[PDB]
């Protein structure tokens, strides 16, 4: 079946141009919204929240770890540092490395976070062993954004990675306090306003993990808090054909707003 949401989204995607994927958990009934649903895309910088979420679990057994210093070398700088760069022949901890990929998306820093995992390997693994069969993780910053169409590599699907943020943020794959850790990161984010957020009642809360990369990839997922009603999860995922073409935030946020309309 196509619901009028799916014939919405669909009409949205005609005009972009590009691939769109979307797969909303409304948790008040457990049900789903998928659009492309079980399609492969390119994650991008969305695959920090399992990095993240990877060194979270570590902690657990471990309570002085995000305290723990990691060198932060000039060779270690890749393309995109801005909380990195200020600690070059210094050191960030792994709390300071998590924050700095979340909300501000440091590549530099998502690398330490892939390398204390034992790189990107051990990401995966962590996805698999919180229910995740979809989640891949292969290569490291920058090289994980090329989003080249067709490509298994750093690519998930729209349902998997809902689920697996439904049970990071608001179930039970993380102890309390991390999985508290994780919202209060993803709640202060700074790259978020103009993706999911834009399409949305201004009344509600976000919390949420921007990406692009190469084909105009444009990604976001999120854990939003309506007004008057139990927190959704929602991801939204959009690449082109053309390799050179713009980002396209405006196209996550039509899909959002679609989305809110049919609740
Ligand atoms: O920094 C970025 N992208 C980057 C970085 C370094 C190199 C290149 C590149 N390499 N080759 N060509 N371009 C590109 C980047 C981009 C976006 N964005 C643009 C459109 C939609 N979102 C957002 C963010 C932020 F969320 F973090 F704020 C960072
Ligand atoms: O690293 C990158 N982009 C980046 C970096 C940091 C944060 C974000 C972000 N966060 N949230 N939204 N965007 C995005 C990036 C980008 C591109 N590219 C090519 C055309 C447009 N882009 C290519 C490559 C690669 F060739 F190396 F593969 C990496």
Not at 50 to 62: F, G, I, R, Y
């Amino acid at each position: 079946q196509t619901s009028a949401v799916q014939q919405k989204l669909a009409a949205l995607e005609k005009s972009s141009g590009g691939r769109l994927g979307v797969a909303l958990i409304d948790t008040a009934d457990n049900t789903q919204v998928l659009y492309r649903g079980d399609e492969r895309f390119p994650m991008c910088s969305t695959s920090k929240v399992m990095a993240a979420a990877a060194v979270l679990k570590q902690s657990e057994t471990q309570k002085q770890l995000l305290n723990q210093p990691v060198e932060i070398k000039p060779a270690d700088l890749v393309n995109y540092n801005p909380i990195a760069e200020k600690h070059v022949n210094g050191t960030m901890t792994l709390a300071e490395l998590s924050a700095a990929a979340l909300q501000y998306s440091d590549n530099t820093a998502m690398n330490k976070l892939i390398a204390q995992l034992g790189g990107p390997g051990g990401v995966t693994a962590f996805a698999r062993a919180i229910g995740d069969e979809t989640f891949r993780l292969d290569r490291t910053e920058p090289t994980l954004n090329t989003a080249i169409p067709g490509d298994p590599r750093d690519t998930t699907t729209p349902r998997a990675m809902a689920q697996t943020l439904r049970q990071l943020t608001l179930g039970h794959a993380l102890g309390e306090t991390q999985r508290a850790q994780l919202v209060t990161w993803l709640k202060g984010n700074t790259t978020g306003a103009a993706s999911i957020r834009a399409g949305l009642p201004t009344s509600w809360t976000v919390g949420d993990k921007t990406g692009s990369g190469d084909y105009g990839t444009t990604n976001d997922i999120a854990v939003i808090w309506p007004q008057g009603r139990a927190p959704l999860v929602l991801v939204t995922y959009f690449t082109q054909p053309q390799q050179n073409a713009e980002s396209r935030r405006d196209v996550l946020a039509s899909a959002a707003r679609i989305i809110a309309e049919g609740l």
